[PDB]
Amino acid sequence: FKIYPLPEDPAIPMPPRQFHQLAAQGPQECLVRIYIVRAFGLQPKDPNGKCDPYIKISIGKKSVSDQDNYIPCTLEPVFGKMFELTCTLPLEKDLKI
Amino acid sequence: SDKPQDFQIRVQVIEGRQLPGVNIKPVVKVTAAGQTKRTRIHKGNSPLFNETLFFNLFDSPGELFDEPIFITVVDSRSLRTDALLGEFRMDVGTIYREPRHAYLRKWLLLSDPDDFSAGARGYLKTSLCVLGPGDEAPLERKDPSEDKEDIESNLLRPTGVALRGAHFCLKVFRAEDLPQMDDAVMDNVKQIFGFESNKKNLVDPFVEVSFAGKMLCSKILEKTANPQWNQNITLPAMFPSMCEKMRIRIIDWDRLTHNDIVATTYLSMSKISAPGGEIEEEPAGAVKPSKASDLDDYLGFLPTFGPCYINLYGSPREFTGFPDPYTELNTGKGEGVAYRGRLLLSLETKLVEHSEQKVEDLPADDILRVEKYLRRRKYSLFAAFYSATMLQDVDDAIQFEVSIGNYGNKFDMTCLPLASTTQYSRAVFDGCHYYYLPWGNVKPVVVLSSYWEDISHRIETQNQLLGIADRLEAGLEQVHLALKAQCSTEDVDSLVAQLTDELIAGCSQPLGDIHETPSATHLDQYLYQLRTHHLSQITEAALALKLGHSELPAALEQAEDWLLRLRALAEEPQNSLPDIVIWMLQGDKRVAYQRVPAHQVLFSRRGANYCGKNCGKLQTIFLKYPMEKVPGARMPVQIRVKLWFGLSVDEKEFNQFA
Amino acid sequence: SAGWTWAGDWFVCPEKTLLHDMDAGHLSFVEEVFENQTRLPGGQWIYMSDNYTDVNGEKVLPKDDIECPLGWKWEDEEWSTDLNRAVDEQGWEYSITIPPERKPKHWVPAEKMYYTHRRRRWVRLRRRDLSQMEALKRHRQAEAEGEGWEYASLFGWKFHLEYRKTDAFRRRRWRRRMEPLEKTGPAAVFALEGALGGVMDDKSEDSMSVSTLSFGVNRPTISCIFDYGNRYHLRCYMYQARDLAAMDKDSFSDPYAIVSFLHQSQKTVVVKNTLNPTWDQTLIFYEIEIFGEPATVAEQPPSIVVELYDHDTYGADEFMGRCICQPSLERMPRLAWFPLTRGSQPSGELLASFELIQREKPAIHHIPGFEVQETSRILDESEDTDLPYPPPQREANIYMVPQNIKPALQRTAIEILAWGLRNMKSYQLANISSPSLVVECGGQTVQSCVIRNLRKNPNFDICTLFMEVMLPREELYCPPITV
Amino acid sequence: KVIDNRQFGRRPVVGQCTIRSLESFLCDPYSAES
């Protein structure tokens, strides 16, 4: 939104458009690279007193996870994992990691 | 079972009753499914929620048992320490298995779930339905007349069986100035035997109490104008009651026709009891000398009431042989439009683990000690009418009638010293849509003197506390006037300091001694010590807010909380004063009415700060149609008035208000 | 009476007073006439020229016998049938055969064979000359007029307002007025209450249970009377209303406001077909007075009620709600938004300001009773010449809000780039598939194209939305821009 | 008389003692430090 005053004098030319955009309106699919480095200071989530972290990403209408690729019972686990994931914009633009 | 289903569990958080604390600000919130949410936070002495929350659990009928909704009541305020007022941790499997898969109009006992025999800290009204894929329960009932009973009207997670009740012994002595309700047919029948006709068809009055789901009835009198009972009727109820207010609904016997009600009234249980304790841990200000709001002498008590006169109201006092179109006024619905009798009684309460119903005959000592509490004084009421506008559909000349209790009613009198009515006049069109009364420079006045007991020793406290509330309320407007001006916080602090000087100055206003009155009871001992207790409490709150500095939102919370108490502390359940009711008439036909308390126009010689806020002031008032809820598209009339009230000894002071 | 003395001698006090100034501070007024017609239960309607009545059933002159009052001009040269009321297509209300009471209470906008009386309303508009209201003071100095006499063949009954040859007797009502003794003051009124109830002694033909304390009337009336009032000058500035509910079936309204006062009511210009109507109008009110001592009166102003109605073909029956506002002593009152409430149901807000300028010169009135008036002197300070600049006119005698009160205006361009919508959830998985882009503010709108499928394409083919309007440069007078 | 800290403003007696052997505890107070 751009809201601005103009002079009442009718002899004054109208202002131009302030902004323009590329008409990339359609399904501009983009490849997403998720880089997971490490985590630390993580809390236990159940009575076992341990935590076994993994990344689940909700991407648009799809779900991405690697629940079986983790290091058990580690306080400051190193991941170093990369996810090669597709994404159609602006339909799957909402990536909850 | 062994078949998991998507059960939607819907729980509604409705309202709290009889909770500890002042202006408590509880929040009920439950999260689920990886989501973060917040719920509305509700503040007040008796906070309302009216919010539904639900969750979807894919458990079997025997598994959803272990996944309850974690309802908590967390009291969060900025001026004092937060607290948990109770929480509920009961299974939800029992409810699904039981028929309907739901409970309706039930309360949750608020306490610590694992604290045995802790006692109730108030109750939360809720509803719960468990809806499986093949089940439905969108239909709920919250009818307030059905959950009055304190037994099996709630769910007990804490204190699963450890409830404690009380026996409320109602000593009912007598009633006076009752309306005639006995079927008029007797007036035509008695003439068959040569008896004279009259307007004194006496009913068959008796004492009846209905509360907490239970009703008691005792000895019935017949054909009696001014009944005496001297009966003690004891009704059991929970000490931490699930009812905030007690209803007085007495059905008089009628030997001629079906039994009916002459009048009704209500008494708040928050005014005569303190089941949550009289002392809150909320010492607003920089001083906390007792580690509590202030130092109390009682710190909690059972509901109790000394001998006092009860003012009952209902439909018009005129006697008829026809059905009353406003019967509901006598059924405890809304409020009455006429005074319908004076009832005197007292309450004694015993704390017990069991409920019992008993009736006892009073000893002479209970009568003589009550009769000696009977006194009458002359009171002075003045009202002036400055203008009247926005009239509609005027067919005839308009007159109004105003009376106090049973005094000043033109149909119940043959001769009175002064009029309660004025000259009839025609309405004049305003040129667009409305008519007005052409009073010109003549401003009609009504002066009446009612006669009733002297409670001025408690009245001064009421206006004292309200006067303080009124001066403090002004503090809120001034800071908001500065807020729109884009003032600094320092400017707000300056206004707070100016307000504080007035706030402490008002704390110098002395409290009356109510122990001198021979009719004073232990309840008055409660009132006196509570009044001195709370008077110091506001004194403590004063000054301290000037010593410190704060952002406006904090200053506003301070005044709002103190204002609620200052007004609440002006409450007095022992109200022996009939109110003032005014009707607008077309000819002799009732059109619209209003009900006015006299305490806001009341004067005392003790000082200006013991007077009502409208004492000698111009006021704008509106009347409402019979059974009106809103002014709608058109309201009866807009009237400008000035009122003054006080004792006959205050006559000399009236002049400054004239 | 005890603690009291006589305020003055006996004065004539007619049961009703019909002498009133209904034009006091009025610039416009709508008059109405009730034409009654009757018939036999077995017959048809007949007309009588003397069957015109007032609202109270009193006899009045025919509509065509009404002449223009001084200082006024007619807007309507003739009476028209009033169809802005709950009447039938012929402009009549109908009622069932009237009983001996001769006071019809049941009226409907429908004709029935058992209805033997009908009433039509005539409507005629009048507006004041934009000059002086002096004509109102010349003919309304008296509080009441006439000798108070009614004529009868025998005193006590069958009285008439006109003399007949058979009228051997006449009757008129007299009233006395008492004043409190200064030893007790006005409080002396309580020296009567509870005292006079025991005061009555009848040793003559004058016999009443209420004698001495009162006569004629069962109970003596009381009043406060003033011989003066506190005059004010009032101007109402109606700029614009926003977000008003529509009353018409077609989701539009034709609102006009009525400024409701204790004895005044004026109608604003009606704005057609909009829920955000702009008036930019000023209404001027004269001789506004409040009774009482000025020391406390100035601090206790009356509420002003603004009643909005949605104009329609059957009249503005659909009342939109009433707003409560207050004037100030500001010479050019600042505009502010005030709520309109109907039935305790707020229906929108109005941007307006009001003034109630204190006049030094009091209103002059007479206290009933044969006494010398306390206000024997008049303070002849300027009546209306020390007032702030009066508003400009848009039409004859139609005022606009002064530019000193109006905001300075600017041309405002609102340029919006509507890339797309988000968080569209699932509204039936159909009705959010093609959401439009529309902008409305102040009755001004922007329209745009609609895309059939924005579920797979949340972005728009056309993202251009543009509005150009005149706005207030003042934030207080400039409403939040709506979309 | 010993008083309990009871809830709801009550101050009940928990119990008391009756000592008729008070003479048996008589001693000389100033035979020690004072």
Swiss-Prot record, chain B:
GO terms for molecular function: calcium ion binding; calcium-dependent phospholipid binding; phospholipid binding. It is found in: Cell membrane, Sarcolemma; Cytoplasmic vesicle membrane; Cell membrane. GO terms for cellular component: centriolar satellite; cytoplasmic vesicle membrane; early endosome; endocytic vesicle; endosome; extracellular exosome; late endosome; plasma membrane. Residues 1-108, 147-283 form the C2 domain. It comes from the Eukaryota. All seven C2 domains associate with lipid membranes in a calcium-dependent manner. Domains C2 1 and 3 have the highest affinity for calcium, the C2 domain 1 seems to be largely unstructured in the absence of bound ligands. The C2 domain 1 from isoform 14 does not bind calcium in the absence of bound phospholipid. Key calcium ion sensor involved in the Ca(2+)-triggered synaptic vesicle-plasma membrane fusion. Plays a role in the sarcolemma repair mechanism of both skeletal muscle and cardiomyocytes that permits rapid resealing of membranes disrupted by mechanical stress. Interacts with CACNA1S. Interacts with ANXA1; the interaction is Ca(2+)- and injury state-dependent. Interacts with ANXA2; the interaction is Ca(2+)- and injury state-dependent. Interacts with CACNA1S and PARVB. Interacts with TRIM72/MG53; interaction is required for transport to sites of cell injury during repair patch formation. Interacts with RIPOR2; this interaction occurs during early myogenic differentiation. Interacts with CAV3 and PARVB. Interacts with AHNAK; the interaction is direct and Ca(2+)-independent. Interacts with AHNAK2; the interaction is direct and Ca(2+)-independent. This is Dysferlin. It comes from Homo sapiens (Human). The chain holds residues 214 to 871 of 2080 of the full protein.
